[PDB]
Design a protein around this ligand. Structure first.
Ligand SMILES: Nc1ncnc2c1ncn2[C@@H]1O[C@H](COP(=O)(O)OP(=O)(O)OP(O)(O)=S)[C@@H](O)[C@H]1O
Lengths: 171, 219, 224
């Protein structure tokens, strides 16, 4: 019990919309351009990032993708900023050039011409998130004014931060 | 307002005995606890009974599962009564201040409702603690305690005021558990959940309506 | 005899330890040798009865600092801290009295001697964290001495990856940085202690890991 206190296609957004194919999903509802962006976007897979859950062609061509529930980049620190750099870095490594989005799943896993073009915009996104170590600011400035594997190493150096001590556990 | 500040402080440290103990004093003055001192005495004694009721629910469980051992069950029972005695001792300490100091000084409808509901719960805890004929007398004391509150607040307070739901939530919890009569339990909550929805503080109200909702799907 | 252990367990399932500690010290007065897990009962029984008072002391003191912009509240907040201080001091002096009187003197086994001596050094440290005047200084040495005696005994006979020795070096280190403010000596002890275990690290490995992660996480805290 408990006493008083103390003290299928579903929802739509856009084209984009929600879905229900084998569970709640997102449906990415011109046609030639839509297919082209589908082909480039559909490449991402085989990672913890940029995951899909289905596809559609008719009666309305669309892409079914896995859902996400969390404090997205705009919807909402370093724990994800590593993920974003890694995911874009890994996709860049596989030779997908984006030159262009970040949504939190479980509130912990943030899900997302040349590589540097994506670097330029990522520096701006990182800057807004941070506005703290000075290394974070220096990395963002360098990107706006390096190789993504170098940016990932830059985050590693930014991982120096890790109050109060902690004794043997009370058991 | 030294006692309240000390109690505010004993809450921050999580020393709940001192919470109530210095809160008893301002009640003993014959004053009408404000909307804050009401809550401070409320959390003060709630945590003191939550602990013993939480210990009792453990020791009682052990006493059931100790069918094997013979002397071991003796100690397990011996300790249980030690908690119940600690549980009862705090309860009598709260009801007494209730009847002597709070309800007599009560003037507002929320004041009377709060203190009788407080009287109602502190007889429902005693009911579970009670074993036999005491259960009958104490539960009979329990039913009267809540009922006075319920008939006060059926008309002397707005349909959405939190205590009206707080009276609805626990009065019903007394209905199902102690009386073993879910029918009255769901009837009270459903009426209570219904009249608020029609009348639909808001953030406060929805905090407990979920418990009103869960009770309805519980019994 | 065996009944007291049963009641202490019955007080660590009800999560009421003031009786668990009270029953355990009663077993201590017997003067016999606490068994492998009867000793552990005493540690957790007393480890929780103290931890409750320390954190209660922590917030109250923190309020005293935050409430520097007043008089009556600070007087009462200071007064309430002195109440948590005194309660804690009593519990400290109770455990130590058992250790030096009954447990340490009969600590025949090496593992037991390091366990108690570390525990004696440990429960001395709790006394130091609250003690301010020269009492802190007196407590600082006795924490140091007892920490050290266990520290030496552990090296002589005990393995370098045992949970106690690791917990001893994790605790001793916390004394260095917190009570003494010598992070150089803290990290040297913490770093050396877990470094040695890693060399010989290879159920037995799991427990050492939980302390070791505590050891290493402590280090990263102190470095920066
Ligand atoms: N798989 C998904 N899980 C959860 N939310 C999603 C998912 N796919 C899309 N959304 C939401 O739907 C919104 C639709 O907007 P977006 O597709 O991100 O951008 P857009 O509105 O199409 O405009 P642009 O210019 O193309 S970025 C997103 O901002 C998310 O909030």
């Amino acid at each position: 019990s408990s006493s008083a206190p103390n003290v299928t296609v579903g929802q739509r957004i856009g084209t984009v919309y929600k879905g229900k194919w084998h569970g709640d999903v997102a449906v990415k509802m011109q046609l030639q351009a839509f297919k082209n962006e589908v082909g480039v976007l559909r490449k991402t897979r085989h990672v913890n990032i940029l995951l899909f859950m289905g596809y559609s062609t008719k009666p309305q061509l669309a892409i079914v993708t896995q859902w996400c529930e969390g404090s997205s980049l705009y919807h909402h620190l370093i724990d994800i900023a590593r993920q974003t750099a890694q995911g874009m870095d890994y996709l860049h490594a596989k030779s997908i050039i984006h030159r262009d989005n970040i949504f939190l799943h479980e509130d912990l896993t943030v899900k997302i011409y040349s590589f540097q073009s994506d670097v330029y915009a990522f520096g701006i996104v990182l800057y807004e998130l941070m506005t703290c170590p000075k290394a974070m600011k220096r990395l963002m400035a360098e990107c706006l004014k390096p190789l993504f594997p170098q940016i990932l190493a830059s985050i590693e150096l930014l991982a120096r931060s890790l109050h109060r001590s902690a004794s043997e556990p009370s058991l | 307002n030294e006692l309240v500040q000390k109690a505010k402080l004993a809450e921050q440290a999580e020393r709940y005995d001192d919470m109530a103990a210095c809160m008893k004093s301002v009640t003993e003055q014959g004053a009408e606890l404000s909307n804050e001192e009401r809550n401070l005495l409320s959390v003060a004694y709630k945590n003191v009974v939550g602990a013993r009721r939480s210990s009792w629910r453990v020791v009682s469980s052990i006493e059931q599962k100790t069918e094997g051992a013979e002397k071991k069950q003796q100690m397990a029972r011996e300790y249980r009564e030690k908690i119940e005695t600690e549980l009862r001792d705090i309860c009598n300490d709260v009801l007494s201040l209730l009847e002597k100091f709070l309800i007599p000084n009560a003037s507002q409808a929320e004041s009377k409702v709060f203190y009788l509901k407080m009287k109602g719960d502190y007889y429902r805890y005693l009911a579970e603690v009670a074993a036999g004929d005491d259960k009958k007398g104490i539960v009979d004391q329990s039913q009267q305690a809540y009922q006075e509150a319920f008939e006060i607040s059926k008309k002397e307070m707005q349909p959405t005021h939190p205590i009206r739901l707080g009276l609805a939530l626990n009065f019903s919890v007394f209905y199902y558990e102690i009386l073993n009569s879910p029918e009255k339990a769901c009837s009270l909550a459903k009426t209570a959940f219904d009249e608020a929805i029609a009348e639909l503080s808001y953030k406060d109200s929805t905090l407990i309506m979920q418990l009103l909702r869960d009770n309805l799907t519980l019994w």
